[PDB]
Design a protein that fits this description.
This protein is an alpha/beta fold. The chain has one domain: Rossmann fold (3-Layer(aba) Sandwich). Helix content is about 30%, strand content about 25%. The protein is built from 7 helices and 9 strands; from the N terminus they run ααββαααββαβββαββ. The strands form 2 sheets. Strands 3-2-1-4-5-9-8 form a 7-stranded mixed sheet, with helices on both faces. A two-stranded antiparallel ribbon has the order 6-7. A hairpin with a 2-residue loop joins strand 6 and strand 7. The radius of gyration is 17 Å and the shape is globular. It starts with 8 loop residues before the first helix and ends with a strand. The structure holds S-adenosyl-L-homocysteine and the ligand O=S(=O)(Nc1ccc(Cl)cc1)c1ccc2c(c1)CNCC2. The site of S-adenosyl-L-homocysteine (SAH) has 20 residues, from loops. Pathway: Catecholamine biosynthesis; (R)-adrenaline biosynthesis; (R)-adrenaline from (R)-noradrenaline: step 1/1. Belongs to the class I-like SAM-binding methyltransferase superfamily. NNMT/PNMT/TEMT family. One of its GO terms (molecular function) is phenylethanolamine N-methyltransferase activity.
Length: about 260
């Protein structure tokens, strides 16, 4: 937990979204796969509404590229102040912001609505209304009087829950906790690491709860969801860079019933 204090946003981005784990040219890379999962889901025109909340966004934005065209009010979050700042720098187009163009581009490519990436980024930057601190450990993750429209029509979270839970039970709770933020009949799009027990972020070393695909499924069920879709990406050996011990990545499309 306190370990997340030494968490360096730039070391994290560099380790996971810079080449080779970030190259999008090769179709069999985790990047193409993940953006594709997101794109396809939203393309079914079933996950929509007005407001959408991104849990534990960290310093990344990709997780919303295909999503931003379906929700006009978007709320980004994260426990660390450093991250919320790193996001602001990208959102305001301030200097030293991480470059996500490559991703915006591939997202536009995958969607195939002939959209240029500048337009896609413009839309995202516009629909992201706020960036609020959050804590998935508290029963009311966002707090008491949150500027964020509640309950949201949909939720999105990539690599958070399992990266902040010491064991399955915690994982389960933090899932129940955020579930409360989602309006019934709503949609949840969760991404995460499969069987990962640790990952580096600069000086900080995070101890994760290694979880499988069935454990993730069952956990979603227990928290009151119906698993619309669940896919797995087994990490190739060339993407095993030393920054962690992840085995694969998962994608879930759940709906609060
Ligand atoms: N208690 C907590 N509740 C919510 N987020 C937390 C948290 N403790 C740490 N975090 C944040 O969860 C993130 C895990 S890393 C995931 C980053 C990003 N969503 C991506 O897709 O890569 C970090 O940004 C960390 O600051
Ligand atoms: O899938 S990734 O290798 N990179 C990656 C993901 C998604 C896209 Cl679109 C491109 C690249 C990855 C992202 C985050 C984390 C980990 C791995 C393991 N550590 C916890 C956090």
């Amino acid at each position: 937990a306190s370990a997340y204090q030494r968490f360096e946003p730039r070391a994290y981005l560099r380790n996971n979204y810079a080449p080779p784990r970030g190259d999008l040219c090769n179709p069999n890379g985790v990047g193409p796969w993940a953006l594709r999962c997101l794109a396809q889901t939203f393309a079914t025109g079933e996950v929509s509404g007005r407001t959408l909340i991104d849990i534990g966004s960290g310093p990344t934005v990709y997780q919303l590229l295909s999503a931003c065209s379906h929700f006009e009010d978007i709320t980004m979050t994260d426990f660390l102040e450093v991250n919320r700042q790193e996001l602001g720098r990208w959102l305001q187009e301030e200097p030293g912001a991480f470059n996500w163009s490559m991703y915006s581009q591939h997202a536009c490519l995958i969607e195939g609505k002939g959209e240029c990436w500048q337009d896609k980024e413009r839309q995202l930057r516009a629909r992201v209304k706020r960036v609020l601190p959050i804590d998935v450990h508290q029963p009311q993750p966002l707090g008491a009087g949150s500027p964020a429209p509640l309950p949201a029509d949909a939720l999105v979270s990539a690599f958070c829950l399992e990266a902040v839970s010491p064991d399955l039970a915690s994982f389960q709770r933090a899932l129940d906790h955020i579930t409360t933020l989602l309006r019934p009949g709503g949609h949840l799009l969760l991404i995460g690491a499969l069987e990962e027990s640790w990952y580096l972020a600069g000086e900080a070393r995070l101890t994760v709860v290694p979880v499988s695909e069935e454990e993730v499924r069952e956990a979603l069920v227990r928290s009151g969801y119906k698993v619309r879709d669940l896919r797995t990406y087994i990490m190739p050996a060339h993407l095993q860079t030393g920054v962690d011990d992840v085995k694969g990545v998962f994608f879930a499309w759940a709906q609060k019933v």
